[PDB]
Design a protein around this ligand. Structure first.
Ligand SMILES: *CCC(=O)Nc1cc(-c2c[nH]c3ncnc(Nc4ccc(OCc5ccccn5)c(Cl)c4)c23)ccc1OCCN(C)C
Ligand SMILES: [Cl-]
Ligand SMILES: [Mg+2]
Length: 266
């Protein structure tokens, strides 16, 4: 479906401001000024590091532009020059990890459980589209509005987040939808701890042996045993025994109908 992805001319958008840079590239806050339409759209522009053929890039960009789910970021446009520039709608509240750290004192049980539902819905859609994320984390969930979050940075792989990866991904480089469930459990742990680092102070070289010994991320103080058991099942060695994203939508949606029963916050 070629119409889903806009191939942007360099004149159609302007990098107004830097939002942040990392190893993979620089993200800008900018304006989309489409040719012959008399509007100015605020957008985010990620310029990847200058590195892979144009046809291969566009083929993956077409997949990113074809997602149609309220909790999955959609690629609005792309510009192919010396670099690859990805254009999508601006998420003004930033990533969910920075958001919970900034607003920890003002976040209640309903907000946290609703986020777990929306993230599970976005992942279930990615699984139904036969897409594996391979990097699900609180940093890769963007906040459009405080109660509308979207998953991003999926399919960009086309160093390694050891502390978010399932054991079979660390030791065997196996990436499946059930390996995304492990990362989902860690993502939930980030939110329930209001943005704490998983396995803080432990080198990534030792994470595999820690998981082999049976140690997992500790129970966040606000989580009841029902919430923590669901997180613990996401970290099972047998990937087939971990919950599916479909079941994760159902359990957290029922918990969201009575949030104070499952999360104890001051
Ligand atoms: C958790 C910290 C963080 O994420 N920081 C961060 C946030 C943004 C950012 C803020 N507001 C935004 N609105 C919209 N988009 C972004 N950032 C992104 C992310 C991915 C992008 O393309 C990938 C993609 C596009 C479509 C579908 C799937 N995947 C784009 Cl184009 C924009 C955003 C921006 C930058 C940062 O941090 C950057 C460097 N950090 C130090 C890691
Ligand atoms: Cl990023
Ligand atoms: Mg990112």
């Amino acid at each position: 479906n070629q119409a889903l992805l806009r191939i942007l001319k360099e004149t159609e958008f302007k990098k107004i401001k830097v939002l942040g840079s990392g190893a993979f590239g620089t993200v800008y806050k900018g304006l989309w000024i489409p040719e012959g339409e008399k509007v100015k759209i605020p957008v985010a522009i990620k310029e990847l590091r200058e590195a892979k053929a144009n046809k291969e890039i566009l083929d993956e960009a077409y997949v990113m532009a074809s997602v149609d789910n309220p909790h999955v970021c959609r690629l609005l446009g792309i510009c192919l020059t010396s670099t690859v520039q990805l254009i999508m709608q601006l998420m003004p509240f930033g990533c969910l990890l920075d958001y919970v750290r900034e607003h920890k004192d003002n976040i209640g049980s309903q907000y946290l459980l609703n986020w777990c539902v929306q993230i599970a819905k976005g992942m279930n859609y990615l699984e139904d589209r036969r897409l594996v994320h391979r990097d699900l984390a609180a940093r890769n969930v963007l906040v459009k509005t405080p109660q509308h979050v979207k998953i991003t940075d999926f399919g960009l792989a086309k160093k390694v987040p050891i502390k978010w990866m399932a054991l079979e991904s660390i030791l065997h480089r196996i990436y499946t939808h059930q390996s995304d469930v492990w990362s989902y459990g860690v993502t939930v742990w980030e939110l329930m701890t209001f943005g704490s680092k998983p396995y803080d102070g432990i080198p990534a070289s030792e994470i595999s042996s820690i998981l082999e010994k049976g140690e997992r991320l500790p129970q966040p103080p606000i989580c009841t045993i029902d919430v923590y058991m669901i997180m613990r099942k996401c970290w099972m060695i047998d990937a087939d025994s971990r919950p599916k994203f479909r079941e994760l939508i159902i359990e957290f949606s029922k918990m969201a109908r009575d949030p104070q029963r499952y999360l104890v916050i001051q």
